[PDB]
Amino acid sequence: SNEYNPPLGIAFRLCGLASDRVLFSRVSPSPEVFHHPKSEVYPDQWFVAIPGSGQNAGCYAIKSKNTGKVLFSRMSPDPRVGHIDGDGKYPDNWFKFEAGSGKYAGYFRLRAVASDTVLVSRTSTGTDTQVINYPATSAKYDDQYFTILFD
């Protein structure tokens, strides 16, 4: 239940509900993977969805149009959230977009099934831990919800 399907063949930004910031992937400067206020649109904020197959049917890899890298989410090693080359070669590259309901209609969590984690974008901690992950089979918070933007 609760599968969300992003559009294919069009780039999008991923904006956090709690943070009003969009994810990004760049090779420089550091940090390479972080988030940015949504009012400022930059080339590192654009991603496409790569459909999965087999046990990953209904999941997607999140591929940067800016670096070519896909996002990952894992419990260890550090860093727990980042990016890596390819088109989803590793299990922790495969996300179920887990559809929200109620106040979260329109939004989804980004659940890395293989690591049992969800992505987080928040402003309630210092910058070193504003973009991170959290166990997926645990409490839900607004900072785990994202939506797709085309501007």
Ligand X SMILES: OC[C@H]1O[C@@H](O[C@H]2[C@H](O)[C@@H](O)[C@@H](O)O[C@@H]2CO)[C@H](O)[C@@H](O)[C@H]1O
Q: Which residues bind ligand X (CB under 6 A)?
A: 24, 26, 31, 34, 36, 42, 44-45, 72, 74, 82, 84, 90, 92-93, 120, 122, 124, 129, 132, 134, 141, 143-144
Nearer to ligand X, 10 or 42 (CB): 42
What's the CA gap between 86 and 64, in Å, rounded?
10
Could you tell me the smallest distance in angstroms from the CB atom of residue 84 to ligand X?
Answer: 4
How far, in whole angstroms, is CA 69 from its chain's centroid?
A: 13
Could you tell me the smallest distance in angstroms from the CB atom of residue 3 to ligand X?
Answer: 21
Contacts of 138 (CB under 8 A, 6+ apart): none
What's the CA gap between 30 and 19, in Å, rounded?
20
What's the CA gap between 122 and 124, in Å, rounded?
6
Nearer to ligand X, 7 or 37 (CB): 37
Could you tell me the smallest distance in angstroms from the CB atom of residue 120 to ligand X?
Answer: 4
